[PDB]
Curated annotation (Swiss-Prot):
Extra remark: When the enzyme transiently cleaves DNA a phosphotyrosine bond is formed between GyrA and DNA. In the presence of quinolones this intermediate can be trapped and is used as an indicator of drug toxicity. The enzyme-DNA intermediate is also the target of a number of topoisomerase poisons, including toxin CcdB. Few gyrases are as efficient as E.coli at forming negative supercoils. Not all organisms have 2 type II topoisomerases; in organisms with a single type II topoisomerase this enzyme also has to decatenate newly replicated chromosomes.
Annotated protein name in UniProt: DNA gyrase subunit A
Signal sequence, start to end: none
Full-protein positions shown: 682 to 730 of 875
Subunit structure of this chain's protein: Heterotetramer, composed of two GyrA and two GyrB chains. In the heterotetramer, GyrA contains the active site tyrosine that forms a transient covalent intermediate with the DNA, while GyrB binds cofactors and catalyzes ATP hydrolysis. Can form a 2:2 complex with toxin CcdB in which GyrA is inactive; rejuvenation of GyrA(2)CcdB(2) is effected by CcdA.
Upper taxonomic lineage: Bacteria, Pseudomonadati, Pseudomonadota, Gammaproteobacteria, Enterobacterales
Domain comment, as recorded: An N-terminal fragment (residues 1-523) can be reconstituted with GyrB, but the complex no longer has negative supercoiling or ATP-independent DNA relaxation activities, although it is capable of DNA cleavage; ATP-dependent relaxation is inhibited by novobiocin and non-hydrolyzable ATP analogs. The fragment has ATP-dependent DNA relaxation and 30-fold improved decatenation activities, unlike holoenzyme it preferentially binds supercoiled DNA. The C-terminal domain (CTD, approximately residues 535-841) contains 6 tandemly repeated subdomains known as blades, each of which is composed of a 4-stranded antiparallel beta-sheet. The blades form a circular-shaped beta-pinwheel fold arranged in a spiral around a screw axis, to which DNA probably binds, inducing strong positive superhelicity (about 0.8 links/protein).
Domain of life: Bacteria
Compartments where found: Cytoplasm
UniProt family annotation: Belongs to the type II topoisomerase GyrA/ParC subunit family.
Length: 49
DNA sequence: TTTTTTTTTTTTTTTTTTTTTTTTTTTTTTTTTTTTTTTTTTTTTTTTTTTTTTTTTTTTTTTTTTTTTTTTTTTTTTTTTTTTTTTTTTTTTTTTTTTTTTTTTTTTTTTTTTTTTT
């Protein structure tokens, strides 16, 4: 499913919150400007559940 | 004066078509059955002061495994093309307004005759 969707601008740092006690931060500018009906880019090597 | 040719509507009854009585399938419609909303009050739940012993964060230091890292080659991403769907101009058709032209039906009442059934 889709975890959550927020509307953001360039150079705004985004954080994740795993349900197995994890939190990460990657500048949003690192990742390429995606398009519709495409695949996805990995973010977090979240092992297990 | 007798006798000879031709013309059509009827004895027609049968073939073709039309008209008129019929009853399977998807679209309506009334019923029962399950989702919603407002009150009473009711034990019951729940909001807020005081005290208390607790158990997790912050002085300080340690390491190691996730954060550094560079690079090969994949493969998702993007490009062009074409098909399918959505949506809006365009057109067509139909309805209502008020003076005109035309029509068409259902029943009482009595008395007499046809026209079927028993």
């Amino acid at each position: 499913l889709i975890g959550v969707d927020l509307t953001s601008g360039e150079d705004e740092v985004m954080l994740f919150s795993a349900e197995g006690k994890v939190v990460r931060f990657k500048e949003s500018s690192v990742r390429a400007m995606g398009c519709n009906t495409t695949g996805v880019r990995g973010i977090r090597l979240g092992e297990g559940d």
